[PDB]
């Protein structure tokens, strides 16, 4: 358990993936060339989890970039860190998908899944002890959603014992008012319930409400949204990139956070809420369990917590964190399931993120996440009842029975969250 292969698919995948490689490379002290310019150690003890050694004091990210649109090929290179990626990992097709989930999963995407799987091979053989895979993408589009889920199922066939972890971006009309996104998202959630071990549900709906209402951003841009995304991805992977004990196993995370195989959709949170260019222990533990700090548009006070994981970063008293965490579980004792004893894990890390002396990263498996799936299932039903734009998908091989099966599975997923939300122990 050590190496991790990162894959970013589509425009949103490469957009939020690039910001991930720019923030963590600064923490470990990595320049765009790949050299180590850090003044303190511990930045290279777990560096090989996300990087390799390319000879010459060089560290290259274990990243693979894929998008049907060749425009993203130039967008990544033009970035500040768009030169540390390897030219052998860029995989880009001819034409885009046009928000068609069928073009990513059955036609255009299938005509490129073998090109990506070949570079995942030479990357897997470079790993001494691979522990899993990582994928960033959105569910509203056609490439990152249609081809992303297909690539997940293909890598799983060749690596059945490896962990599949994804950072999925939920669609929202407040950021993108495209009416075919509820189609592609529903068809993707149907795939993520089966072929993934843990999915970080990042909701553009929640990201817009944080920038517009809490950060006073009248017209939030994708850079404003991705600032919160890059801050969350760095925190949820803190125990993977720095010592701080607690090992660094994706499977140990899944065993303790996923009580039922279909309920592997996590709700992330971050505190404090900072802007792009712009506390104490009782404050960090307070905002973490606040609905305004959740990266998914759900109120955790509407459901019950099955499992919870919190990561604190910076110099702080481990004794005081134990007091506040054990106390929050009492003021909100009715919001944790009683049939899972000791269902809250606390972790502290020495190195805080840049520009902040202290931080906190919340990872929750709450039943309140059904409010997110209820939102998309309603938009899916409103469009599917009128058969609107359904010929965009039936003309690419896919047929009508998959839309109903995808709809029947998400309502079953909501039924399972409500089932375990009302369960008592007695």
């Amino acid at each position: 358990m050590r190496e991790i292969v990162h894959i970013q698919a589509g425009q949103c995948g490469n957009q939020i993936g690039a910001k991930f490689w720019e923030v963590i490379s600064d923490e470990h002290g990595i320049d765009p060339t790949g050299s180590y310019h850090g003044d303190s150690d511990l930045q290279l003890e777990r560096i090989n989890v996300y990087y390799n050694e390319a000879t010459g004091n060089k560290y290259v990210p274990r990243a693979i970039l894929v998008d049907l649109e060749p425009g993203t090929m130039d967008s990544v290179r033009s970035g500040p860190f768009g030169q540390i990626f390897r030219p052998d990992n860029f995989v880009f097709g001819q034409s885009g998908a046009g928000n068609n989930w069928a073009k990513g999963h059955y036609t255009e995407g299938a005509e490129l899944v073998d090109s990506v799987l070949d570079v995942v091979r030479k990357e897997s053989e470079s790993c001494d002890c691979l522990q899993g895979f990582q994928l960033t993408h959105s569910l509203g589009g056609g490439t990152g959603s249609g081809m992303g889920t297909l690539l997940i199922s293909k890598i799983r066939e060749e690596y059945p014992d490896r962990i599949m972890n994804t950072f999925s971006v939920m669609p929202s009309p407040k950021v993108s008012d495209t009416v075919v996104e509820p189609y592609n998202a529903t068809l993707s959630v149907h795939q993520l319930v089966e072929n993934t071990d843990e999915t970080y549900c990042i909701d553009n709906e929640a990201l817009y409400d944080i920038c517009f209402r809490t950060l006073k951003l009248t017209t939030p841009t994708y850079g404003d949204l991705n600032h919160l995304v890059s801050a969350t991805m760095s925190g949820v992977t803190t125990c993977l990139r720095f010592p701080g004990q607690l090992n660094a196993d994706l499977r140990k995370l899944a065993v303790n956070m996923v009580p039922f195989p279909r309920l592997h959709f996590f709700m992330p949170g971050f505190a404090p809420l900072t802007s792009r260019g712009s506390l104490t222990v009782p404050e960090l533990t307070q905002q973490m369990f606040d609905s305004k700090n959740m990266m998914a548009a759900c109120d955790p006070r509407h459901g019950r917590y099955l499992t919870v994981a919190a990561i604190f970063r910076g110099r702080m008293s481990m004794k005081e964190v134990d007091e506040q965490m054990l106390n929050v579980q009492n003021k909100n004792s009715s919001y944790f399931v009683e049939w899972i004893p000791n269902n809250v894990k606390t972790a502290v890390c020495d190195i805080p993120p840049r520009g902040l002396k202290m931080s906190a990263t919340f990872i929750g498996n709450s039943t309140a996440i059904q409010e997110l799936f209820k939102r998309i299932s309603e938009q899916f039903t409103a469009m599917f009842r009128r058969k609107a734009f359904l010929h965009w998908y039936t003309g690419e091989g896919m047929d009508e029975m998959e839309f109903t099966e995808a709809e029947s599975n998400m309502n079953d997923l909501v039924s399972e969250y409500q089932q375990y939300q009302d369960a008592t122990a007695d």
């Binding site: 358990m1 090992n247 303790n256 009580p259 004794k319 375990y420 122990a425």
Partner: protein, 437 residues
């Protein structure tokens, strides 16, 4: 002289075993390179410390210990630690992927591709012995390796060493220093499968050691270092009879004879006193009567339970230091009648006493202060059924909804084993009730 082989499984077994062997060398006067200057016989001997230490031709004293873990992170610290020269290099066996806190991975899948190698290395240590009497197995309850792999190893040793004894030092899970939510599961699974292959098991409640560090040692946030240092102090008091001269528990069979009245109820309760912080070097010296009184206080026990709830079946007192046998009998006679010490109807109602006149050894860097006399009480009481009741409750809270179960079934294990293990624990609690608790 009958050799004993120690086996350290998993992270908790390796780190505790590493602290026990450091303390063993300080008690026996053995240097980190294995040199024992006080050993007049070079190349061998019939001494009582040879049960734990073999001797090479160059006077090197190598422990009869095996370190096993499915991942190399913990054992690599032993290969680079202070005693990197002490242990046999081929007796530090490491895997590639750990059991991921899953009993099924440690027992059925991941643990099965190294069990044959561990047995061959254990065979090599047994071929050097002239009168092997048994094994000492250190492991945790909650870990995937400490529960899954240990239950597999104990099964194998019963077939390859059917006439030898097997003692356990188990780490009982505590919510303060727990690493997994499924640790109640793993603890029940390994207990059921090992209950038949274990002659005697000393459970170490991590919450007991945690509270002792906070109260007596003034350690605000006890770490694994603070816990294992106190645990190694108590483990040495238990195995001192095997390593030195004496007349109480001189071999592994006597442990089973004096402490285990019936095969299934082989979980003695250990109590240790006194525990004084190293910040007080001029503390008052507790008498024999005051340290013997402390053994009957539930705050000094290694497993959280109330012995006044249950009844005793056996009691052994192991003293260390300046202790006159006249004062023990006097201390016994008072703490025999001034307390509510109830023995069962079918026992001699007696206290076995063994005295070692060398004071306890403290390690440089530890939290304990030097004492002129200490005592470790080994008692088998039905009150220890409280530990099984607490563990079976958390097991039942999760298994009623089948939470986290799919992780175990997906690794070669069948869901029917969950029921068989819980049914066996219900019979164990009933075994303590048929005696009185």
């Amino acid at each position: 002289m009958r050799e004993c082989i120690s086996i350290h499984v998993g992270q908790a077994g390796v780190q505790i075993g590493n602290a026990c062997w450091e303390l063993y060398c300080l008690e026996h006067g053995i240097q980190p390179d294995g040199q024992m200057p006080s050993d007049k016989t070079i190349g061998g001997g019939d001494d009582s410390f040879n049960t734990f230490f073999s001797e090479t031709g160059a006077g090197k004293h190598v422990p009869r210990a095996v370190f096993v873990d499915l991942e190399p992170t913990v054992i690599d610290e032993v290969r680079t630690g202070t005693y990197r020269q002490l242990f046999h290099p081929e007796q530090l066996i490491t895997g590639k992927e750990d059991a991921a806190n899953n009993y099924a991975r440690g027992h059925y899948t991941i643990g099965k591709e190294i069990i044959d190698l561990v047995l061959d290395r254990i065979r090599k240590l047994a071929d050097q012995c002239t009168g092997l009497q048994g094994f000492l197995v250190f492991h945790s309850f909650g870990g995937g390796t400490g529960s899954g792999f240990t239950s597999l190893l104990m099964e194998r040793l019963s077939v390859d060493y059917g006439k030898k004894s097997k003692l356990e030092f188990s780490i009982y899970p505590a919510p303060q220093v727990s690493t997994a939510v499924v640790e109640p599961y793993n603890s029940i699974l390994t207990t059921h499968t090992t209950l038949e292959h274990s002659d005697c098991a000393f459970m170490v409640d991590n919450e007991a050691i945690y509270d002792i560090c906070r109260r007596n040692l003034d350690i605000e946030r006890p770490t694994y270092t603070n816990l294992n240092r106190l645990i190694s102090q108590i483990v040495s008091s238990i195995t001192a009879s095997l390593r030195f001269d004496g007349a109480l528990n001189v071999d592994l069979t006597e442990f089973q004879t004096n402490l285990v009245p019936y095969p299934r109820i082989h979980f003695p309760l250990a109590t240790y006193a006194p525990v004084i912080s190293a910040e007080k070097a001029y503390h008052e010296q507790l008498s024999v009567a005051e340290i013997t009184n402390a053994c009957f206080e539930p705050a000094n026990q290694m497993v959280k339970c109330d012995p006044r709830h249950g009844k005793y079946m056996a009691c052994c007192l192991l003293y260390r230091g300046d202790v006159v046998p006249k004062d023990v009998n006097a201390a016994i006679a008072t703490i025999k009648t001034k307390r509510s010490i109830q023995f069962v109807d079918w026992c001699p109602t007696g206290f076995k006493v063994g005295i070692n006149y060398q004071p306890p050894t403290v390690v440089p860097g530890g939290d304990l202060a030097k004492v002129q006399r200490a005592v470790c009480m080994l008692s088998n009481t039905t009150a220890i059924a409280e530990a099984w009741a607490r563990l079976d409750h958390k097991f039942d809270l999760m298994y009623a909804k089948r939470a986290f179960v799919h992780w175990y079934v997906g690794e070669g294990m069948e869901e029917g084993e969950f029921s068989e293990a819980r049914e066996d624990m219900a019979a164990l609690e009933k075994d303590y009730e048929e005696v009185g608790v």
